Write an enzyme that holds these catalytic residues in place. Structure first.
Site, PDB file in Angstrom:
ATOM      1  N   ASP A  92      30.384 -61.964 -17.897  1.00  0.00           N
ATOM      2  CA  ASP A  92      29.240 -62.382 -17.079  1.00  0.00           C
ATOM      3  C   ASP A  92      27.962 -61.816 -17.702  1.00  0.00           C
ATOM      4  O   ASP A  92      27.969 -60.685 -18.220  1.00  0.00           O
ATOM      5  CB  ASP A  92      29.427 -61.868 -15.644  1.00  0.00           C
ATOM      6  CG  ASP A  92      28.524 -62.602 -14.617  1.00  0.00           C
ATOM      7  OD1 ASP A  92      27.720 -63.465 -15.039  1.00  0.00           O
ATOM      8  OD2 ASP A  92      28.638 -62.318 -13.395  1.00  0.00           O
ATOM      9  N   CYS A 115      31.008 -71.093 -13.405  1.00  0.00           N
ATOM     10  CA  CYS A 115      31.171 -69.687 -13.736  1.00  0.00           C
ATOM     11  C   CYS A 115      31.062 -68.966 -12.385  1.00  0.00           C
ATOM     12  O   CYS A 115      31.568 -69.522 -11.408  1.00  0.00           O
ATOM     13  CB  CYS A 115      30.138 -69.235 -14.754  1.00  0.00           C
ATOM     14  SG  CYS A 115      28.422 -69.874 -14.489  1.00  0.00           S
ATOM     15  N   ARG A 139      26.735 -69.011 -17.878  1.00  0.00           N
ATOM     16  CA  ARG A 139      27.801 -69.493 -18.768  1.00  0.00           C
ATOM     17  C   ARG A 139      27.977 -71.002 -18.670  1.00  0.00           C
ATOM     18  O   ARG A 139      28.150 -71.680 -19.697  1.00  0.00           O
ATOM     19  CB  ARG A 139      29.116 -68.757 -18.429  1.00  0.00           C
ATOM     20  CG  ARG A 139      28.996 -67.326 -18.977  1.00  0.00           C
ATOM     21  CD  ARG A 139      30.152 -66.396 -18.443  1.00  0.00           C
ATOM     22  NE  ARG A 139      30.065 -66.149 -16.998  1.00  0.00           N
ATOM     23  CZ  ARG A 139      30.899 -65.354 -16.323  1.00  0.00           C
ATOM     24  NH1 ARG A 139      31.948 -64.777 -16.934  1.00  0.00           N
ATOM     25  NH2 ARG A 139      30.632 -65.068 -15.031  1.00  0.00           N
ATOM     26  N   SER A 140      27.905 -71.566 -17.447  1.00  0.00           N
ATOM     27  CA  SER A 140      28.065 -73.012 -17.300  1.00  0.00           C
ATOM     28  C   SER A 140      26.974 -73.749 -18.052  1.00  0.00           C
ATOM     29  O   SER A 140      27.241 -74.806 -18.639  1.00  0.00           O
ATOM     30  CB  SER A 140      27.995 -73.408 -15.802  1.00  0.00           C
ATOM     31  OG  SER A 140      29.130 -72.806 -15.138  1.00  0.00           O
ATOM     32  N   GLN A 153      21.131 -68.094 -18.638  1.00  0.00           N
ATOM     33  CA  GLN A 153      20.515 -66.974 -17.913  1.00  0.00           C
ATOM     34  C   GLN A 153      19.988 -65.861 -18.786  1.00  0.00           C
ATOM     35  O   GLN A 153      19.327 -64.944 -18.254  1.00  0.00           O
ATOM     36  CB  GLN A 153      21.537 -66.387 -16.931  1.00  0.00           C
ATOM     37  CG  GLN A 153      21.660 -67.258 -15.665  1.00  0.00           C
ATOM     38  CD  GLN A 153      20.464 -67.037 -14.761  1.00  0.00           C
ATOM     39  OE1 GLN A 153      20.328 -65.946 -14.182  1.00  0.00           O
ATOM     40  NE2 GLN A 153      19.515 -67.989 -14.743  1.00  0.00           N
TER      41      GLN A 153
HETATM   42  O1  LIG Z   1      28.471 -66.470 -13.881  1.00  0.00           O
HETATM   43  C1  LIG Z   1      27.487 -66.741 -14.624  1.00  0.00           C
HETATM   44  O2  LIG Z   1      27.500 -66.956 -15.867  1.00  0.00           O
HETATM   45  C2  LIG Z   1      26.151 -66.683 -13.920  1.00  0.00           C
HETATM   46  O3  LIG Z   1      25.207 -67.428 -14.220  1.00  0.00           O
HETATM   47  N1  LIG Z   1      26.076 -65.658 -12.997  1.00  0.00           N
HETATM   48  C3  LIG Z   1      24.923 -65.390 -12.284  1.00  0.00           C
HETATM   49  S1  LIG Z   1      23.490 -66.108 -12.325  1.00  0.00           S
HETATM   50  C4  LIG Z   1      22.779 -65.171 -11.215  1.00  0.00           C
HETATM   51  C5  LIG Z   1      23.629 -64.104 -10.752  1.00  0.00           C
HETATM   52  C6  LIG Z   1      24.986 -64.274 -11.439  1.00  0.00           C
HETATM   53  C7  LIG Z   1      26.216 -63.367 -11.229  1.00  0.00           C
HETATM   54  O4  LIG Z   1      27.323 -63.724 -11.715  1.00  0.00           O
HETATM   55  O5  LIG Z   1      26.100 -62.250 -10.617  1.00  0.00           O
HETATM   56  C8  LIG Z   1      23.317 -63.071  -9.748  1.00  0.00           C
HETATM   57  C9  LIG Z   1      22.089 -63.456  -8.968  1.00  0.00           C
HETATM   58  N2  LIG Z   1      21.026 -63.983  -9.831  1.00  0.00           N
HETATM   59  C10 LIG Z   1      21.377 -65.171 -10.648  1.00  0.00           C
HETATM   60 CL   LIG Z   2      16.100 -68.774 -15.239  1.00  0.00          CL
END
Ligand SMILES: O=C(O)C(=O)Nc1sc2c(c1C(=O)O)CCNC2
Ligand SMILES: [Cl-]
Ligand SMILES: [Cl-]
Ligand SMILES: [Cl-]
Ligand SMILES: [Cl-]
Ligand SMILES: [Cl-]
Length: 300
Positions: free
Chosen positions: A183, A217, A223-224, A264
């Protein structure tokens, strides 16, 4: 010789400017309303308060009660491929998740996270782990059975049977589970990432004869967004047979018209470039690189 995305890649690397490039994308990204996602009755259907589907592209469940699921249709018009990106389902939304798979006629589900990451539960256990312990989602009247699974060193492919208990129709759903992609992180190498993406492609799950593949994800954006950007860019290059026609940042901004936050971190952007540049070798007619990736990924 060099493609134009490789010349850009080298200049960004040389100047150390991935952060600034990525923040410019965040700054230019679309902002559309998410009023349905924010209704009080849907608060327990969202995993993260800051990750919501836009109203205009959200997937609607065919349910008179409450049609909301945190999922978006990413409809790539020029590429002619669509994806459904969704969060990892919660304990109360696994029925909704399989209802969406059913109603949208998806053939494959691509899961890029583990259920537990960083000490937290990032996704509900929404599929059965044992053949003899099938799952019934009473709210949506669906039955889900594990038929077989093929476990490799860093990903697993499962064959699931999804049954609509109202009609007794059954469908085979393929589940592609990447188990070594952290993650907020990147895959271990372009090769192992591309080996996985090409396993999804080879299955036929992205065929336009099926509904959109479902990708998730934990939040359905980081990841998606990375796998979908790489796939779309490679498909655009393929249709064209022209790597130079592909503007990766422009494709990501187009995808972000349909769901917020796709990709992200700056390093996931950088990794997307690496994956597209390497996958281009296959697109432009060296099919032997595919065997190279499988060897480099140590599936066994
Ligand atoms: O699983 C991913 O790749 C993903 O984008 N995760 C994300 S995006 C995202 C979060 C998370 C997380 O997993 O905590 C936490 C809150 N802010 C945005
Ligand atoms: Cl963003
Ligand atoms: Cl409400
Ligand atoms: Cl897991
Ligand atoms: Cl952990
Ligand atoms: Cl959960």
């Amino acid at each position: 010789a060099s493609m134009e995305m490789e010349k850009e890649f080298e200049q960004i690397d040389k100047s150390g400017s991935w952060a600034a490039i990525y923040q410019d994308i965040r700054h230019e990204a679309s902002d559309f309303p998410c009023r349905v996602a924010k209704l009080p009755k849907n608060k327990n259907r969202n995993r993260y308060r800051d990750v919501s589907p836009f109203d205009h592209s959200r997937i609607k469940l065919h349910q008179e009660d409450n049609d909301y699921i945190n999922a978006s249709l990413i409809k790539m018009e020029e590429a002619q491929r669509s994806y459904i990106l969704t969060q990892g389902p919660l304990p109360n939304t696994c029925g909704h998740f399989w209802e969406m798979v059913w109603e949208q006629k998806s053939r494959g589900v691509v899961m890029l996270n583990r259920v537990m990451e960083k000490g937290s539960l990032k996704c509900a256990q929404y599929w059965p782990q044992k053949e003899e312990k099938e799952m019934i989602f009473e709210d949506t009247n669906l039955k889900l059975t594990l038929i077989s699974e093929d476990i490799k060193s860093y990903y697993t492919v499962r064959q699931l049977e999804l049954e609509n208990l109202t009609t007794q129709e059954t469908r085979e759903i393929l589940h592609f589970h990447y188990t070594t992609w952290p993650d907020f992180g990147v895959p271990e190498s372009p090769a192992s990432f591309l080996n996985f993406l090409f396993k999804v492609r080879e299955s036929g799950s992205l065929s336009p004869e099926h509904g959109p593949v479902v990708v998730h994800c934990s939040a359905g954006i980081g990841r998606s967004g990375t796998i979908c950007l790489a796939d779309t860019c490679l498909l655009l290059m393929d249709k064209r047979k022209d790597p130079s026609s592909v503007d990766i940042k422009k494709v990501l901004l187009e995808m972000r018209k349909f769901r917020m936050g796709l990709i992200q971190t700056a390093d996931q952007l950088r990794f997307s470039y690496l994956a597209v540049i390497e996958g281009a070798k296959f697109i432009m007619g060296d099919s032997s690189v595919q065997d190279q990736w499988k060897e480099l990924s140590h599936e066994d």
